[model samples]
Target chain A: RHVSSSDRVGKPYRGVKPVFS
Target chain B: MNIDVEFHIRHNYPWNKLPANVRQSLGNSQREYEKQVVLYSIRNQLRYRNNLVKHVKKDERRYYEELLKYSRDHLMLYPYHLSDIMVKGLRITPFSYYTGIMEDIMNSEKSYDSLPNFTAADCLRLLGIGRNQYIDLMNQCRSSKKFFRRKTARDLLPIKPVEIAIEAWWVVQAGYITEDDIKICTLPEKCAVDKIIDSGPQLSGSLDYNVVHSLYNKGFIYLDVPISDDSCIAVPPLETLLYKIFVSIDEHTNVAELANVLEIDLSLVKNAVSMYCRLGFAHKKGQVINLDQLHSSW
Candidate 1:
């Protein structure tokens, strides 16, 4: 049973949005 | 009175047998006559006034009646506006639907001055309608400019030229733009002159204005290029006709004339012209676009 790479990064990655886009 | 006049007069004429250009020319003449009659009425001149030739033969009797009827209905709700006919005459279902909505925009309680609000030909042409339809409607309402202004008083909507208004709608509906995007901004000018990073989407809006001031001032997205009529178009190589036009455009001509000479669809000519502007062929700084070596066979 291989742990997925997704498990390494952690569950909920919250990306910040940029302004003047 | 019971005799069918159209059968006796126009039946042998073989209207459809004539070429489209010839038919269109005939239609143009008829429209011009109608315009004069409408104008005479608006000016309140009556009884063979304004040099209306005294030749009321049976073939021409219909016009005098139209003139009197339109002029006599000069009361506030002057029957149907010429644009109303164009609006109803739109072939597209959605645009045809817009006729009612536009009428609502007119009838709505709002304050509007002249010049910037929608006109009949302007309103019916959301897209897919051609320059001919617009010209026809405008010709129909030669004296109805004032009336058009009165109707556009429906709300506080911004008053833009017919071309700009159509572009605004085009961009917004294209889903990349919004009222905010163009509200006070405009597209960049360099987009018109820049090298082809990619051929890009075909511009779906209007032409004819020499300067748009600030495209960014409105909510228009800067996909690429600046705003102005002097700007040349950039068509993809796949667009064969537009490529042909770009290569062939050493001379100046209007869309209608170009289409006839090139033997292409009016809409195709239109899009190609827009492409010509985008390609920067027409923007070569007071000089001709000389591709003679590439066009040796042409």
Candidate 2:
């Protein structure tokens, strides 16, 4: 889920982590 | 006598599919944008043509537009290697086609509203051509040392998508979906064996027995002495023995040699042998065991 900077909503890529280097 | 042992093997999510951060450096916002956009575009095109429909309540039009923009922007920013794109295209197209079919079924006044449930049996039906073709493709890709070797670990690895497609194809072949609503389809959980190993000592130990039992039940061994059955139990659980056995077997150690390394009694060694045998996991024609069976069973 993305968080909006304006609404302080979650950033689009906040919690999701990447696996590949 | 042929004995069949069914052991429950938990699926491990593939390393490539984990949230990029948890698995590696691939989960950056920029990278994720590119991946998400590509996925969205494929899904959108199928949905727009009435070949696919969104099962979720989210607005399809907005979703597609956003995804398209995201894809166009990101692709321009970090152009994928031509080869990576080609590989990705091969995987994405089939998924799109499948999505389209589901969309048609959902919108139509047919009996089923969405994709049907899938099972392993379906994998059998897909052999030879339709689904079989994909397996062949996967194998070829796997064999093409160049394809995998040339790409860095950071390359656009589709291990997640490939796995999902394989599972979906199996489901379809199994007759799970009468209709094709892509939106309603829930991706099955991808299994990564590595995660099970990395989850920490407590979790790993809890699952080790089941894991080893699965390998044994699948015929990794050629005998059936129950180590846990007797009153004079001197060995660890079948699970712990399995880890040691897995390592030892890889080094091509003999049973006696393996027993020496693990400091386990000969009876425990014998138990491993029997478990592998009764389950038909491996065959002992004259003493040389099959290590391939262990890897394959997983």
Model 2, C-alpha of B171: deviation from truth (Å): 40
Best by DockQ: 2
Model 2 RMSD in Å is 22.9
Residue-level lDDT of model 2, residues B1-298, one tens digit each, is 0011000001122334445443334344444433433354343222322321232214554544443344332221111111112111121122222322322332332222122222111121211123344344444444554654642211211211122111100001010111121122223201212232234112212223333333212211111122222212122223234444533552344555656766765544555554343223333333222443323422
TM-score of chain B of 2: 0.17
How much is the lDDT of residue B218 in candidate 1? 25
In order, the first chain's TM-score in every candidate is 0.20, 0.16
**Local error of candidate 2 at residue B258 (angstroms):** 1.9
